Amino acid sequence: ATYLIGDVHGCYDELIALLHKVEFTPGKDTLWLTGDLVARGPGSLDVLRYVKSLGDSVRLVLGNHDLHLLAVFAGISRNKPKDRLTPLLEAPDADELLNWLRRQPLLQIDEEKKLVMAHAGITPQWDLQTAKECARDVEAVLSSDSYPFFLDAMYGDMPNNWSPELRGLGRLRFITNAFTRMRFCFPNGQLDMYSKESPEEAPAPLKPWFAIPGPVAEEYSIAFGHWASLEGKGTPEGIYALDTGCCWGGTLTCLRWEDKQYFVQPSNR
Ligand SMILES: [Mn+2]
Numbered sequence: 670a671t672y673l674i675g676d677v678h679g680c681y682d683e684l685i686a687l688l689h690k691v692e693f694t695p696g697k698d699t700l701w702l703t704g705d706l707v708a709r710g711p712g713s714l715d716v717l718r719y720v721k722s723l724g725d726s727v728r729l730v731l732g733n734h735d736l737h738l739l740a741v742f743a744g745i746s747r748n749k750p751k752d753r754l755t756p757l758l759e760a761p762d763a764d765e766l767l768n769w770l771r772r773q774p775l776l777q778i779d780e781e782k783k784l785v786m787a788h789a790g791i792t793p794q795w796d797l798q799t800a801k802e803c804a805r806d807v808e809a810v811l812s813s814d815s816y817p818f819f820l821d822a823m824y825g826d827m828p829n830n831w832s833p834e835l836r837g838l839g840r841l842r843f844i845t846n847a848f849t850r851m852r853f854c855f856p857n858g859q860l861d862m863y864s865k866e867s868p869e870e871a872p873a874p875l876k877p878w879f880a881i882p883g884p885v886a887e888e889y890s891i892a893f894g895h896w897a898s899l900e901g902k903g904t905p906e907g908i909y910a911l912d913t914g915c916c917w918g919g920t921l922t923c924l925r926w927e928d929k930q931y932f933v934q935p936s937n938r
Pocket residue numbers: 705732733734788849894895896
Protein backbone atom coordinates (compact mmCIF):
# COMPACT_ATOMS: atom_id res chain seq x y z
CA ALA A 670 0.00 0.00 0.00
CA THR A 671 0.99 3.65 -0.46
CA TYR A 672 0.73 6.01 2.53
CA LEU A 673 1.28 9.79 2.40
CA ILE A 674 1.76 11.67 5.69
CA GLY A 675 1.94 15.44 6.19
CA ASP A 676 4.45 17.54 8.13
CA VAL A 677 5.77 15.56 11.11
CA HIS A 678 7.67 18.41 12.82
CA GLY A 679 9.32 16.19 15.41
CA CYS A 680 6.05 14.48 16.39
CA TYR A 681 7.66 11.06 16.56
CA ASP A 682 5.09 9.47 18.89
CA GLU A 683 2.17 10.49 16.68
CA LEU A 684 3.99 9.36 13.54
CA ILE A 685 4.62 5.88 14.94
CA ALA A 686 1.09 5.63 16.34
CA LEU A 687 -0.36 6.52 12.94
CA LEU A 688 1.88 4.07 11.10
CA HIS A 689 0.88 1.35 13.56
CA LYS A 690 -2.79 2.25 12.96
CA VAL A 691 -2.37 1.40 9.26
CA GLU A 692 0.06 -1.49 9.93
CA PHE A 693 2.69 0.15 7.75
CA THR A 694 5.05 -2.63 6.71
CA PRO A 695 8.24 -1.83 4.75
CA GLY A 696 8.53 -4.32 1.90
CA LYS A 697 4.75 -4.36 1.45
CA ASP A 698 4.10 -0.62 1.77
CA THR A 699 5.76 2.66 0.84
CA LEU A 700 5.54 5.89 2.85
CA TRP A 701 5.59 9.37 1.28
CA LEU A 702 6.45 12.27 3.60
CA THR A 703 5.78 15.92 2.71
CA GLY A 704 8.85 17.16 4.61
CA ASP A 705 9.34 19.36 7.64
CA LEU A 706 10.33 16.25 9.54
CA VAL A 707 11.96 18.40 12.21
CA ALA A 708 11.41 21.36 14.54
CA ARG A 709 8.70 22.50 16.98
CA GLY A 710 7.73 19.02 18.15
CA PRO A 711 10.06 17.32 20.65
CA GLY A 712 11.38 14.31 18.74
CA SER A 713 13.22 15.56 15.65
CA LEU A 714 16.13 13.24 16.46
CA ASP A 715 13.97 10.11 16.61
CA VAL A 716 12.05 11.15 13.48
CA LEU A 717 15.21 11.58 11.43
CA ARG A 718 16.71 8.30 12.70
CA TYR A 719 13.54 6.38 11.82
CA VAL A 720 12.92 7.96 8.41
CA LYS A 721 16.53 7.42 7.36
CA SER A 722 16.27 3.77 8.41
CA LEU A 723 13.36 3.22 6.00
CA GLY A 724 15.55 3.53 2.87
CA ASP A 725 13.63 2.68 -0.32
CA SER A 726 10.42 2.29 1.73
CA VAL A 727 10.19 6.07 2.15
CA ARG A 728 9.92 8.86 -0.44
CA LEU A 729 10.72 12.18 1.24
CA VAL A 730 10.67 15.76 -0.01
CA LEU A 731 12.52 18.46 1.92
CA GLY A 732 10.63 21.31 3.58
CA ASN A 733 11.66 24.77 4.73
CA HIS A 734 12.30 23.65 8.32
CA ASP A 735 14.48 20.78 7.07
CA LEU A 736 16.56 23.30 5.11
CA HIS A 737 16.74 25.66 8.10
CA LEU A 738 18.02 22.78 10.24
CA LEU A 739 20.77 22.14 7.69
CA ALA A 740 21.64 25.85 7.77
CA VAL A 741 21.93 25.77 11.57
CA PHE A 742 24.08 22.62 11.37
CA ALA A 743 26.37 24.29 8.82
CA GLY A 744 26.79 27.47 10.91
CA ILE A 745 24.84 29.59 8.41
CA SER A 746 21.85 30.41 10.63
CA ARG A 747 21.26 30.84 14.33
CA ASN A 748 19.52 28.16 16.36
CA LYS A 749 16.04 29.26 17.43
CA PRO A 750 15.12 27.87 20.89
CA LYS A 751 11.51 27.38 19.73
CA ASP A 752 12.63 24.84 17.11
CA ARG A 753 13.83 22.34 19.80
CA LEU A 754 16.67 21.13 17.57
CA THR A 755 19.43 20.88 20.17
CA PRO A 756 19.13 17.12 20.93
CA LEU A 757 19.43 16.39 17.21
CA LEU A 758 22.28 18.86 16.69
CA GLU A 759 24.17 17.40 19.68
CA ALA A 760 23.55 13.76 18.76
CA PRO A 761 26.64 11.63 18.08
CA ASP A 762 25.13 10.65 14.73
CA ALA A 763 24.15 14.21 13.74
CA ASP A 764 26.65 14.24 10.84
CA GLU A 765 25.31 10.93 9.47
CA LEU A 766 21.68 12.03 9.80
CA LEU A 767 22.09 15.49 8.31
CA ASN A 768 24.39 14.43 5.47
CA TRP A 769 21.65 11.96 4.57
CA LEU A 770 18.95 14.65 4.92
CA ARG A 771 20.61 17.10 2.55
CA ARG A 772 20.75 14.39 -0.16
CA GLN A 773 16.99 13.91 -0.23
CA PRO A 774 14.73 15.17 -3.03
CA LEU A 775 12.69 18.34 -3.30
CA LEU A 776 10.25 16.61 -5.67
CA GLN A 777 8.78 13.08 -5.95
CA ILE A 778 7.01 11.86 -9.12
CA ASP A 779 5.23 8.53 -9.63
CA GLU A 780 4.05 8.20 -13.21
CA GLU A 781 1.95 5.06 -12.65
CA LYS A 782 0.04 6.83 -9.88
CA LYS A 783 0.05 10.15 -11.80
CA LEU A 784 1.16 11.61 -8.49
CA VAL A 785 3.51 14.50 -7.71
CA MET A 786 4.66 15.59 -4.25
CA ALA A 787 6.61 18.64 -3.08
CA HIS A 788 6.66 20.37 0.29
CA ALA A 789 4.62 23.45 -0.67
CA GLY A 790 3.14 22.23 -3.97
CA ILE A 791 3.90 23.06 -7.61
CA THR A 792 3.75 26.71 -8.64
CA PRO A 793 1.31 27.22 -11.56
CA GLN A 794 4.21 28.92 -13.37
CA TRP A 795 5.97 25.54 -13.79
CA ASP A 796 5.31 22.71 -16.17
CA LEU A 797 6.55 19.27 -15.18
CA GLN A 798 9.85 19.43 -17.09
CA THR A 799 10.74 22.76 -15.47
CA ALA A 800 9.79 21.48 -12.01
CA LYS A 801 12.06 18.45 -12.57
CA GLU A 802 14.97 20.56 -13.78
CA CYS A 803 14.69 23.02 -10.90
CA ALA A 804 14.50 20.23 -8.33
CA ARG A 805 17.57 18.62 -9.88
CA ASP A 806 19.50 21.89 -9.72
CA VAL A 807 18.77 22.60 -6.07
CA GLU A 808 19.24 18.95 -5.07
CA ALA A 809 22.61 19.11 -6.80
CA VAL A 810 23.72 22.09 -4.73
CA LEU A 811 22.37 20.59 -1.49
CA SER A 812 24.20 17.29 -2.09
CA SER A 813 27.52 18.94 -2.93
CA ASP A 814 30.46 19.62 -0.66
CA SER A 815 29.67 23.33 -1.06
CA TYR A 816 26.12 23.15 0.29
CA PRO A 817 26.64 25.74 3.10
CA PHE A 818 27.22 28.41 0.44
CA PHE A 819 23.88 27.57 -1.18
CA LEU A 820 22.11 27.43 2.17
CA ASP A 821 23.33 30.97 2.79
CA ALA A 822 22.24 32.05 -0.68
CA MET A 823 18.74 30.52 -0.38
CA TYR A 824 17.49 33.14 2.09
CA GLY A 825 15.48 35.87 0.38
CA ASP A 826 11.99 36.76 -0.80
CA MET A 827 12.86 37.82 -4.37
CA PRO A 828 12.54 37.21 -7.19
CA ASN A 829 8.92 36.00 -6.91
CA ASN A 830 8.15 35.55 -10.63
CA TRP A 831 9.48 32.62 -12.64
CA SER A 832 11.24 33.05 -15.95
CA PRO A 833 13.41 30.51 -17.81
CA GLU A 834 15.85 33.43 -18.15
CA LEU A 835 16.39 33.67 -14.39
CA ARG A 836 20.04 32.97 -13.52
CA GLY A 837 22.23 32.55 -10.47
CA LEU A 838 21.23 33.51 -6.95
CA GLY A 839 17.76 34.69 -7.96
CA ARG A 840 17.07 31.45 -9.82
CA LEU A 841 18.02 29.31 -6.81
CA ARG A 842 16.11 31.52 -4.38
CA PHE A 843 12.96 31.35 -6.46
CA ILE A 844 13.22 27.57 -6.84
CA THR A 845 13.68 27.14 -3.08
CA ASN A 846 10.76 29.44 -2.26
CA ALA A 847 8.46 27.76 -4.81
CA PHE A 848 9.14 24.24 -3.50
CA THR A 849 9.30 24.97 0.24
CA ARG A 850 7.60 28.28 1.16
CA MET A 851 4.77 28.86 -1.38
CA ARG A 852 1.23 29.45 -0.22
CA PHE A 853 -0.46 32.34 -2.02
CA CYS A 854 -0.12 33.56 -5.59
CA PHE A 855 -1.06 36.73 -7.40
CA PRO A 856 -3.42 36.22 -10.37
CA ASN A 857 -0.45 35.96 -12.75
CA GLY A 858 1.10 33.14 -10.68
CA GLN A 859 3.64 35.32 -8.87
CA LEU A 860 4.55 34.15 -5.38
CA ASP A 861 3.49 36.13 -2.32
CA MET A 862 6.08 35.49 0.40
CA TYR A 863 4.29 37.16 3.34
CA SER A 864 0.73 35.93 3.78
CA LYS A 865 0.33 32.74 5.83
CA GLU A 866 -3.40 33.01 6.53
CA SER A 867 -6.11 30.60 5.49
CA PRO A 868 -7.47 31.26 1.97
CA GLU A 869 -10.63 32.87 3.37
CA GLU A 870 -8.57 35.33 5.45
CA ALA A 871 -6.00 36.42 2.88
CA PRO A 872 -6.00 39.94 1.40
CA ALA A 873 -7.20 40.33 -2.17
CA PRO A 874 -6.18 39.58 -4.86
CA LEU A 875 -4.20 36.71 -3.28
CA LYS A 876 -5.36 33.20 -4.17
CA PRO A 877 -3.98 29.77 -3.18
CA TRP A 878 -1.39 28.49 -5.63
CA PHE A 879 -3.65 25.51 -6.36
CA ALA A 880 -6.56 27.81 -7.34
CA ILE A 881 -4.60 28.98 -10.40
CA PRO A 882 -4.71 26.37 -13.20
CA GLY A 883 -1.23 25.08 -13.96
CA PRO A 884 0.04 22.44 -16.38
CA VAL A 885 1.25 20.01 -13.70
CA ALA A 886 -1.99 20.10 -11.72
CA GLU A 887 -3.96 19.54 -14.96
CA GLU A 888 -2.30 16.15 -15.54
CA TYR A 889 -1.15 15.02 -12.06
CA SER A 890 -2.49 14.80 -8.57
CA ILE A 891 -0.37 16.92 -6.22
CA ALA A 892 0.21 16.06 -2.56
CA PHE A 893 1.83 18.65 -0.32
CA GLY A 894 2.24 19.78 3.27
CA HIS A 895 3.58 23.09 4.63
CA TRP A 896 0.37 25.12 4.80
CA ALA A 897 -1.05 24.25 8.20
CA SER A 898 -3.49 27.18 8.29
CA LEU A 899 -5.19 25.50 5.31
CA GLU A 900 -6.13 22.73 7.80
CA GLY A 901 -5.99 20.20 4.96
CA LYS A 902 -9.31 21.38 3.52
CA GLY A 903 -10.63 23.68 0.83
CA THR A 904 -8.69 22.08 -2.01
CA PRO A 905 -9.85 21.12 -5.51
CA GLU A 906 -10.11 17.61 -6.85
CA GLY A 907 -6.65 16.19 -7.31
CA ILE A 908 -4.99 18.43 -4.70
CA TYR A 909 -4.11 16.86 -1.32
CA ALA A 910 -3.17 19.22 1.51
CA LEU A 911 -1.83 16.80 4.09
CA ASP A 912 -0.43 19.19 6.76
CA THR A 913 -3.06 19.30 9.50
CA GLY A 914 -0.77 20.93 12.07
CA CYS A 915 0.18 18.07 14.38
CA CYS A 916 2.96 19.95 16.15
CA TRP A 917 0.53 22.86 16.77
CA GLY A 918 -2.04 20.69 18.56
CA GLY A 919 -3.89 19.73 15.40
CA THR A 920 -3.60 16.25 13.92
CA LEU A 921 -1.23 14.12 11.89
CA THR A 922 -2.89 12.99 8.66
CA CYS A 923 -2.19 9.84 6.64
CA LEU A 924 -3.71 9.21 3.20
CA ARG A 925 -3.72 5.74 1.65
CA TRP A 926 -3.43 6.23 -2.09
CA GLU A 927 -5.11 3.06 -3.35
CA ASP A 928 -8.51 3.87 -1.82
CA LYS A 929 -7.99 7.56 -0.90
CA GLN A 930 -8.75 6.53 2.67
CA TYR A 931 -7.75 8.92 5.47
CA PHE A 932 -6.35 7.97 8.89
CA VAL A 933 -5.77 10.60 11.56
CA GLN A 934 -3.69 10.68 14.74
CA PRO A 935 -4.60 13.32 17.35
CA SER A 936 -1.80 15.54 18.60
CA ASN A 937 -0.39 14.61 22.01
CA ARG A 938 0.10 18.30 22.89
MN1 LIG B 1 6.81 23.99 5.66
